Design a protein around this ligand. Sequence first.
Ligand SMILES: [Zn+2]
Ligand SMILES: [Zn+2]
Lengths: 101, 101, 111, 93, 143, 144
Amino acid sequence: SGVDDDMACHKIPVEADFLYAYSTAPGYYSWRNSKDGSWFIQSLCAMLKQYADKLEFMHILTRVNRKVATEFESFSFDATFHAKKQIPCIVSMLTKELYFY
Amino acid sequence: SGVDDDMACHKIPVEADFLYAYSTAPGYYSWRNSKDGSWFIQSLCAMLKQYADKLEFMHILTRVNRKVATEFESFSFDATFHAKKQIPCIVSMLTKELYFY
Amino acid sequence: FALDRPSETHADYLLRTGQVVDISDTIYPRNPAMYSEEARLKSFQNWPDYAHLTPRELASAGLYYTGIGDQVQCFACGGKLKNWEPGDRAWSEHRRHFPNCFFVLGRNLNI
Amino acid sequence: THADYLLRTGQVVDISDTIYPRNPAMYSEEARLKSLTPRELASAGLYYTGIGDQVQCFACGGKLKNWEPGDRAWSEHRRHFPNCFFVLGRNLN
Amino acid sequence: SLDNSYKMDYPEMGLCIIINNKNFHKSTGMTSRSGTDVDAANLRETFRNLKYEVRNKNDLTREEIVELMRDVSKEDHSKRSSFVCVLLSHGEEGIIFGTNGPVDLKKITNFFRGDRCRSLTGKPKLFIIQAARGTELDCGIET
Amino acid sequence: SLDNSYKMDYPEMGLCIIINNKNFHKSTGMTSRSGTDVDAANLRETFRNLKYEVRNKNDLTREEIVELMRDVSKEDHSKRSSFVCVLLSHGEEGIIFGTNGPVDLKKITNFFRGDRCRSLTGKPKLFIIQAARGTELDCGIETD
Ligand SMILES: [Zn+2]
Ligand SMILES: [Zn+2]
């Protein structure tokens, strides 16, 4: 059995402090360049390189969202896959801000 | 058929600029107080009231995550549901920062 | 249930149907009577001379005297603190031993 | 569908990285400045075509001409080709 | 720089639809969500103070919700800076309940896709969901 | 300020496991992910410059991945400020591929639950996933 020491024991969710930086929205496909890497990773590094030392992680990943959403559009000879866009997906369950600097 | 005009038109993902502020992690239950509202909404308003005028939305919602994760734990006479915790879930697909002020 | 749907799980049932609820709001504060600071202050009628800690500091940390030794109790969590040593700040000790207390946490009590 | 097949199997890929820049030869600004403020146009990635005042972008391949007073190279470049990599900042080569 | 934060100048701040579902048909098997009104209330005050045009709705059916969203998605948000929708109801992974049954959040959400509500394109669309996403419980950890 | 931001002082910055899956068994039906190495490379540089202890892995099987995570989840991250895991592979809603088949992200993720990896409790655990989550395509919308 257990004791009434409920008020003396402090806990945090076992699922807390996790951050999932997805490359595409749920249910969607994720694009790769013929041979120059992927849209997301490409932007991730870029933004990490420029802002790691001056922005909170959420804002950096929000930069990535704009970069991917703004600067990318697919090119295929098959109309079915041509001119497609993509939006990354930030899933944060963090409890504090994360600065790499 | 298409023309060499791609470069002449700019687009953004139709799924971009969306923000889903979930009260609990995927697959998890979400708690309500016997009659005093819900853990999440309660914290949401609280944090919105204090920081709406001085913090970016992500950071505000990150405040909510900590509030819910830190200040709440369930109480039930049934051991099966007693002393349970909860972590909200921020799902951002935003491209810019959002300040309410 | 166990008779009707033997193979299913009652717990999962209660949750899916949203019957599970946190009743903390009917358990705390443990002592409504000592809700107010004044009511609290009014409890140190015989606080021991040896002490290191005055009623106001203790009452302000939500603690009210129990009438025994230097043992006080929290109106919120019901926790008991005693044998206060020099340097012991009411509030700091309160959360050290009861970090999960509503008053300590800032969780709404009742109004 | 064959289409759904190709996607599920991850065979669909963006080949922009093999189509742009449209003209590798005019990749560099100096190469540009070679063949309307030259130093300005070239800086907007546009290189002269040899006809009238018609220039072209090494990246997107777009053509601009008949420049009117007040026309800033770069501003015109993105107005007519807002989807251009050079204009957007998307990696090139 | 320039333009790295949403523009919030626009005349109106935007709509804040609050769907507060408290009672459900016996046909759903779902119990009431007493205490839900305190939320509906609190949110209203909160977002009004933020200059949003709040609109409360209660015990709507899946149809009513779908319909409500569809209508609102067709208003002209041109002079509005953003959009907010708050759902308070039962739910599970990707589902929210109308007083008479479940609906896919996606169906509610799609009405505002950048191509289905041009008036909101490029503007932040916020959805706040207070509902279960399954039956798992976090046992928590000490520290 | 107090509980405003994670503590990043700890001796080490933390691990940065990069799983780079390029070739898959004919049994999976999945095609190769050529160009994936440029990513694996770029990430490595990026996170090294951030002082992370990077560790690359290639063409692991679902078992190897599960195993890899399990092992890493049992190291002692006490002196480490955080943890980062980057997955590059095929996938769909909630799934990622090992060269020989799919695995639930949740299974990989659970190894680091606040109660299964005490060494990381209260520390930020970041998972970066470059993979499909379905076959939907964003047709996009035009911008003034
Ligand atoms: Zn207490
Ligand atoms: Zn161009």
